Each structure stands twice: as C-alpha cells, then as structure tokens.
mmCIF file of C-alpha atoms in Angstrom:
data_model
loop_
_atom_site.group_PDB
_atom_site.id
_atom_site.type_symbol
_atom_site.label_atom_id
_atom_site.label_comp_id
_atom_site.label_asym_id
_atom_site.label_seq_id
_atom_site.Cartn_x
_atom_site.Cartn_y
_atom_site.Cartn_z
ATOM 1 C CA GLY A 11 27.783 113.794 -12.673
ATOM 2 C CA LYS A 12 27.861 114.702 -8.775
ATOM 3 C CA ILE A 13 29.332 113.200 -5.349
ATOM 4 C CA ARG A 14 28.117 114.223 -1.203
ATOM 5 C CA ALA A 15 30.888 114.809 1.039
ATOM 6 C CA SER A 16 31.524 116.217 4.716
ATOM 7 C CA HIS A 17 33.802 118.787 6.306
ATOM 8 C CA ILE A 18 36.596 120.836 8.112
ATOM 9 C CA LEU A 19 37.718 124.305 7.905
ATOM 10 C CA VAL A 20 40.276 125.934 10.058
ATOM 11 C CA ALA A 21 41.697 129.359 9.832
ATOM 12 C CA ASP A 22 45.116 128.354 9.551
ATOM 13 C CA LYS A 23 46.802 124.932 9.019
ATOM 14 C CA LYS A 24 48.148 124.430 12.952
ATOM 15 C CA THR A 25 43.770 123.791 14.115
ATOM 16 C CA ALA A 26 44.475 120.969 11.011
ATOM 17 C CA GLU A 27 47.475 119.230 12.373
ATOM 18 C CA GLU A 28 45.699 118.485 15.418
ATOM 19 C CA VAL A 29 43.088 116.972 13.539
ATOM 20 C CA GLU A 30 44.873 115.017 11.464
ATOM 21 C CA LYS A 31 45.895 113.389 14.970
ATOM 22 C CA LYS A 32 42.573 112.791 16.011
ATOM 23 C CA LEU A 33 41.423 111.694 13.437
ATOM 24 C CA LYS A 34 44.047 108.507 14.339
ATOM 25 C CA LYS A 35 43.239 108.262 17.857
ATOM 26 C CA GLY A 36 39.854 107.560 17.023
ATOM 27 C CA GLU A 37 37.887 110.267 17.449
ATOM 28 C CA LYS A 38 34.728 110.212 14.585
ATOM 29 C CA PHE A 39 35.713 112.423 11.193
ATOM 30 C CA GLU A 40 31.416 114.126 11.906
ATOM 31 C CA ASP A 41 31.933 114.617 15.648
ATOM 32 C CA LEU A 42 35.815 116.525 14.700
ATOM 33 C CA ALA A 43 33.695 118.926 12.835
ATOM 34 C CA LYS A 44 31.746 119.967 15.659
ATOM 35 C CA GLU A 45 34.278 120.063 17.373
ATOM 36 C CA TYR A 46 37.155 122.322 15.171
ATOM 37 C CA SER A 47 35.341 123.579 12.379
ATOM 38 C CA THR A 48 33.824 126.894 11.885
ATOM 39 C CA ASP A 49 31.913 127.020 8.752
ATOM 40 C CA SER A 50 28.215 126.917 8.870
ATOM 41 C CA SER A 51 28.072 122.540 8.720
ATOM 42 C CA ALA A 52 29.907 121.956 12.092
ATOM 43 C CA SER A 53 26.335 121.216 13.273
ATOM 44 C CA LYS A 54 25.343 119.044 10.423
ATOM 45 C CA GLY A 55 28.004 116.921 11.324
ATOM 46 C CA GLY A 56 30.496 118.906 8.282
ATOM 47 C CA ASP A 57 28.310 117.779 5.704
ATOM 48 C CA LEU A 58 27.752 119.200 2.532
ATOM 49 C CA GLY A 59 25.277 117.693 0.275
ATOM 50 C CA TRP A 60 25.475 116.679 -3.139
ATOM 51 C CA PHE A 61 27.942 118.773 -5.913
ATOM 52 C CA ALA A 62 30.415 118.552 -9.283
ATOM 53 C CA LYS A 63 33.732 119.049 -9.755
ATOM 54 C CA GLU A 64 33.419 122.489 -11.297
ATOM 55 C CA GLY A 65 34.174 124.928 -7.929
ATOM 56 C CA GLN A 66 31.204 124.759 -5.781
ATOM 57 C CA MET A 67 32.922 125.760 -2.767
ATOM 58 C CA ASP A 68 36.695 126.402 -4.436
ATOM 59 C CA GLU A 69 37.947 125.189 -7.335
ATOM 60 C CA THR A 70 40.753 123.619 -4.922
ATOM 61 C CA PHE A 71 38.519 121.543 -2.557
ATOM 62 C CA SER A 72 36.354 120.382 -5.711
ATOM 63 C CA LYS A 73 39.494 118.312 -7.298
ATOM 64 C CA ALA A 74 40.332 117.281 -3.401
ATOM 65 C CA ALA A 75 36.571 115.722 -3.030
ATOM 66 C CA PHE A 76 37.011 114.017 -6.200
ATOM 67 C CA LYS A 77 39.980 112.272 -5.990
ATOM 68 C CA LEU A 78 38.278 110.344 -2.902
ATOM 69 C CA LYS A 79 36.539 107.424 -3.059
ATOM 70 C CA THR A 80 33.137 106.401 -0.325
ATOM 71 C CA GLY A 81 34.566 106.503 2.959
ATOM 72 C CA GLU A 82 37.996 108.020 2.722
ATOM 73 C CA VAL A 83 39.589 110.882 3.829
ATOM 74 C CA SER A 84 42.006 113.685 2.541
ATOM 75 C CA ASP A 85 44.948 115.577 3.505
ATOM 76 C CA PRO A 86 44.221 119.376 3.903
ATOM 77 C CA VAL A 87 44.014 121.782 1.731
ATOM 78 C CA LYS A 88 44.287 125.492 1.294
ATOM 79 C CA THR A 89 40.972 127.894 -0.145
ATOM 80 C CA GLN A 90 40.527 131.541 -0.435
ATOM 81 C CA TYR A 91 38.776 130.548 2.712
ATOM 82 C CA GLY A 92 41.076 128.866 5.236
ATOM 83 C CA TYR A 93 42.495 125.263 5.765
ATOM 84 C CA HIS A 94 39.868 122.307 4.581
ATOM 85 C CA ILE A 95 40.073 119.077 5.088
ATOM 86 C CA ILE A 96 37.382 116.683 3.332
ATOM 87 C CA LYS A 97 36.092 113.232 3.478
ATOM 88 C CA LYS A 98 33.453 111.226 0.749
ATOM 89 C CA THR A 99 30.126 109.908 2.072
ATOM 90 C CA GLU A 100 28.160 108.947 -1.398
ATOM 91 C CA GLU A 101 29.399 108.858 -4.963
#
C-alpha cells in the first residue's frame, strides 16, 4: 500500500536540532518547513504526496515514515542527501 507525509531536509544535524526545539516551542511543522527545509518541498509546507515503503524518497526515510501514525512526528534521519525530519499526514 501507500501513505502521505510531510518533511524537512537540512545539510547537517545542527539545523535539525533547532527544529526539534522549535516543534516543542509551539511553531507548526508545516510552517517550519518554509523556514528550515532546503528541498523544493519547503514551499508546499514539506508535503510529498502519496508514496510507499520501498524507498521512493530514500531507503532509510521510507522506513521511518511508515513507523508513524497520521498526525505523529519523527526524530531526525540520515540519508545520502542530508538529515531529514518527517511527520505523517494521511493513510
């Protein structure tokens, strides 16, 4: 099957550690994507549309996205592109 989620991607973990604090401070994940993400998804509030566990974004990212439940947010994930952060939005 498939799921839908939103993400934030950064060049190194030091930017992701600030986003983890910002998420507890009160700012929404969908607006932090417009302020901290470096992927083209930033202007969409981090959204990626529907995808599968097989590795459509990255083989490490997809496993973390599928562990979640709709509404839940994830701790940082290393890939070949940088450090990602994920939040599931539909299933």
